[PDB]
């Protein structure tokens, strides 16, 4: 199938995702609505259920609202059964309308629909070329008070109807009983409760197994992608192990939410995107876009600086999901914000790198500050706004022009209020010019681009005052960019040599199938390379001009560049593919008596690529934790490691450049065939 097909669950680079709160979009079936105090027919009390459901989403796919808007994927609320109880938080009744307070991850939420309704959502969507992404929240169940079992449902978890356990009298240790996080460190936010939400203990092997089994059920139902909630609040090691079981079973595009409040690099956030096996919501792109277009606190140089720095930090910047707002911040539209600034921020997100997501109602200019006002009922299904028109003209370009979906980004002209940038992939080129100044036009002279000689019409057809241009071997004739204008000019052609645009997933064990997307691979099965290893023949499960599916070779675990050769021409290399040693389990490593100096941290390495193959650098594990589950001078860390394998390891202390290793012989441990384990040793 081509890269562009609805069938491509491994890459959303050619898609535009529409993020919807299922409850707030359309009540397509009033008979499944909640009753009593939990429901509000008028939807003016935004903490209660308004009644929106999966039949409502089926209706709008069927009357072409989404196809006309041009979105090609729906990201919906968590589909699983949530608590039924209502919770009174200081006088105001709160419900689980948002989907985040799960109680059974193997059943549907009956207010959104039955399993049959879910299956009908998947079929209807796929028949229209729309992918389905679901929220999944493995960090917690629901609000719970250990001392008061009458509060809410005491965070009880059910396994398809059978009780597994609640937060009070949790003798099995399914949940953490460490109090609530104060968010003072990474560690503190992982092993304590987020507010009053009962925190899962994923080191408990029943819970590990439960979540591997629960996600398999939803993948077997045809979901195309997963948005993981609260990835900052769960151990990276457990999440990498859970990600490797998804990719070994039915690989789908997965991204997480790790909140950031500015456009600055955050080392922990960069590491998570690079090492976990999943990508992230791009809050750094989002802060720069709001600062420049919404709040006027930065100018166009902050936009370009964020483009360069994120392309540098993230190994696969094209896997990061971009947006101008969402469920965690004020709606982009405010009375102080003009419509053209929102339309411009949409035009910029849709033509920039990453996977763009639009929060439902953006095309209707929905307002709302804070939670829950930013989650208002979908106000109209009008197809007439300029915002609607901008998304329907630009979203198709991610499918028809590979420079938008996969290209690099280069600055071509910039000053405080004007930004002109270019996307390029092979011979395809897209150039976007934006003038955010609402009252004065800009005379543009000396612009050079990669557009071939020719004249170019604005893809937006002048709806944002864009103009047409003329290229003479890339030099653009002088023109005036109007007040508030944005114009998009493009050139696509067929690629003749192989060039790789995306590989998904970028982590797996031998035997897993990965998807290579791009252009110019031809119809004749060639060879794929993982480093030096050539993979040919039957190992390549399908080969066409824009997409290859290939089995990962049995080669040593490590970091590899993937390259394709078609008719003796070698492509560009796609870097940083992780091959794992095999199936993964999560092991908690605990080391006693490791005293340290001020500013000295503890790290772990060992003899498999998952522990860094004896390196003391960025592939080593750590720094280890020492506050919540075990306390200094005991340190601990949860690590994804190959299953059923005898491992050798040592801890080491590192303060700057100087490394001090444990003495003696290596510690050894044989990992379990599945699940989790804990190994405790003493510092030598
Ligand atoms: Ca309903
Ligand atoms: Ca947690």
Curated annotation (Swiss-Prot):
UniProt entry tagged with the keyword Disulfide bond: yes
Co-factor binding details: Binds 2 calcium ions per subunit.
Entry binding sites for Ca(2+) 1: 27, 29, 32-33, 51, 53
UniProt keyword list: Calcium, Disulfide bond, Glycosyltransferase, Metal-binding, Secreted, Signal, Transferase
Compartments where found: Secreted
GO cellular component, one term: extracellular region
Region span, E: 581-684
Domain CBM20 intervals: 579-684
Region described as A1: 1-138
Reactions mediated catalytically: Cyclizes part of a (1->4)-alpha-D-glucan chain by formation of a (1->4)-alpha-D-glucosidic bond
Region (A2): 203-406
Region (C) residue spans: 407-494
SUPFAM superfamilies, sorted: (Trans)glycosidases (SSF51445), E set domains (SSF81296), Glycosyl hydrolase domain (SSF51011), Starch-binding domain-like (SSF49452)
Family label: Belongs to the glycosyl hydrolase 13 family.
Oligomeric form and interacting partners: Monomer.
Protein name, entry field: Cyclomaltodextrin glucanotransferase
